[PDB]
Design a protein around this ligand. Structure first.
Ligand SMILES: NC(=O)c1ccc(I)c([N+](=O)[O-])c1
Lengths: 200, 198
């Protein structure tokens, strides 16, 4: 699938690959710094770039649509998502699925949740340590677009005007002034870009 | 890249286009509907021109055609809905998070019927206060399918030792499918809206 970004490595005609990043090169350093800004006490085992051509293609289609609809290109944020080891193969291949969100982690709506700070996704309740103590967190491109405060029980973002109920916000947050989380409610509004495997 | 049979929308992104009973386009839909719904009468048939939904759906179709190594992945199916959901569906498609539970559930997704008679039941195409019932004709990427189960949140894996390689959809019966369930956004494009009455 097309418009692959220039920093991906050649995939030998594969449509999906996980590429372990070389420590000390610019790309690895950039992601490490984002994580260590709030997670300096954790130890990074490796960082992998997710090269999922089909997921990227569908995400970029949604990004172009949101850029057109909102009349600007300020629609993407880089956020974090902690998950358990058993969900990692699914996310790598299929992205994030609101139908899989826990349960008790839905306080601002029934969508997929993304943290501004890696430290929040680093909680064991999200990046559940596996049998060997390894924890997993994604660095995610998220199409947050135009957002509003969320609330429990939402299944889609609220409309921007209750008298035009189909023109929706793009995401919801806990606090519009100083957001710490964003929730998106549609597939392919979030692209898992890097996987960080780390320990306490 | 919008289809050439669509009306020129003057850079608008969404339009409903009323079809004329003369046309082959109208007649094929009427015939597909009447094959199992001879007791009902069509008020109108509208072509749904939704640029963004079409783009995302066509991307998914190309991906599924590549993955399955054939082009037998799409079926034209029916979906009855209440009038209050029509504005949302026209704009945003079918949302599994909004779907009612089916009387026989083969999974938690959006349901599409082979026969218009199924979608024509008042349980799905609920009559509005003016007696109007609403049924979509939908391009659905059914792909490779298996018999569903009520607990499904996505289609099951084809192979339990490769849990991420999924069937594309599920059905009530693989020998004689009458319903298909899909579990992802942009796997179904609402192409026509039939408004009909008893
Ligand atoms: N999976 C996560 O990183 C995650 C789950 C729930 C929440 I409420 C948050 N959060 O950043 O607020 C993150």
């Amino acid at each position: 699938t097309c418009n692959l970004p220039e920093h991906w490595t050649d995939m030998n005609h594969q449509l999906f690959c996980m590429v372990q990043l070389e420590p000390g090169q610019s790309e690895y350093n950039t992601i490490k710094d984002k994580f260590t800004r709030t997670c300096s006490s954790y130890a990074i085992e490796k960082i992998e770039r997710i090269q999922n051509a089909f997921l990227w293609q569908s995400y970029q289609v949604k990004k172009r649509q949101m850029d057109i609809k909102n009349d600007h290109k300020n629609n993407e944020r880089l956020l974090f998502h902690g998950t358990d080891a058993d969900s990692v193969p699914y996310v790598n291949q299929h992205g994030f699925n609101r139908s899989c969100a826990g349960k008790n982690a839905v306080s601002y709506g029934k969508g997929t949740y993304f943290a501004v700070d890696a430290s929040y996704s680093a909680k064991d309740t999200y990046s559940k340590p596996d049998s060997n103590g390894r924890k997993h967190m994604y660095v995610v491109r998220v199409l947050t677009g135009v957002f509003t405060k969320g609330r429990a029980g939402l299944v889609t973002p609220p409309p921007k005007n209750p008298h035009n109920p189909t023109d929706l916000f793009d995401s919801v947050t806990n606090n519009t002034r100083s957001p710490k989380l964003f929730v998106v409610f549609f597939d392919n509004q979030a692209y898992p870009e890097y996987l960080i495997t780390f320990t306490a």
